[PDB]
Every structure is written in C-alpha cells, then in structure tokens.
C-alpha cells in the first residue's frame with residue numbers, strides 16, 4: 001500500500017483504490033494503473049519534473065529504501081492478475097530490485113522529488129508508474 005499527497009490530491013495504484021477514492025474521483029487510467037482522488041487536507045509531497053533515471057524507492061516487504069537505476073516511461077506488457085487481464089501498461093519504468101504484491105504504492109524519488117509509485121514486480125524486477133508528466137497535480 002501507499003499514496004502520494006500533493007495539494008488537494010491523493011495518487012494511488014488504480015487496482016488498490018478504495019470506495020472513497022472512487023466517490024471523490026478526479027482522474028483514472030486503467031492502462032497506467034493510476035487513480036487520483038480529491039482530499040480535504042493539503043499535501044506537501046513535491047513532484048519531480050525531470051528525465052532522471054536514478055532514484056530511491058521504499059520496499060515495504062523489506063522495510064528498506066533501495067537506490068535503483070530505472071528505465072524511461074514506456075509501454076510494457078504486464079501478465080494477467082486478479083486485477084487486470086494481460087495487457088500493455090503505459091508510462092511504466094523498470095529497475096532491478098525487490099518487489100512482491102503488497103509493495104505497490106511505495107514511492108520512488110530522485111534529487112527533484114516524487115517520480116512515481118511501485119506498480120509491478122516479480123522476476124527480480126520492479127515496475128514504477130511514472131507521475132512526472134501529470135503537471136496538473138501541482139495546480
């Protein structure tokens with residue numbers, strides 16, 4: 001689990017969004033595994049606006065932060081799951097590292113702020129749903 005809090009927005013993995021997220025829906029995209037909902041309290045997370053390919057992510061299944069090199073946002077095939085059928089997930093970045101199902105929502109950060117959140121795993125790999133293109137989060 002895990003989310004980003006920026007201004008009056010809450011950003012979560014779409015497959016883990018609650019009833020409250022859907023009742024206060026701002027934007028959702030199944031192909032990116034993202035959903036944004038509105039909040040009453042203000043958020044202070046800073047979103048990175050960059051093309052960084054190195055950063056640090058939080059891995060709940062290890063209670064550790066790990067530094068990683070990650071790929072550029074792209075369309076990557078994601079095997080079927082209880083949440084989605086087999087499909088290409090867009091805006092996804094991969095890194096070599098640990099990720100098991102309950103790790104989704106862990107934040108990835110570079111020197112400029114929040115890059116995205118854990119969205120895929122297995123095979124000694126970790127996938128992050130990029131959020132740096134969502135310029136409307138800051139305004």
Ligand SMILES: Cn1ccnc1[C@@H](c1ccccc1)N1C[C@@H](C(N)=O)CC1=O
Nearest residue numbers: 033079080081099100101119120121122
């Ligand atoms: C099914 N699959 C393929 C690669 N990874 C997964 C698992 C997964 C996620 C995180 C850690 C470990 C495994 N995901 C990815 C999520 C998605 N974005 O669609 C849904 C899901 O269950």
Ligand SMILES: [Zn+2]
Nearest residue numbers: 050052110112
């Ligand atoms: Zn950066």
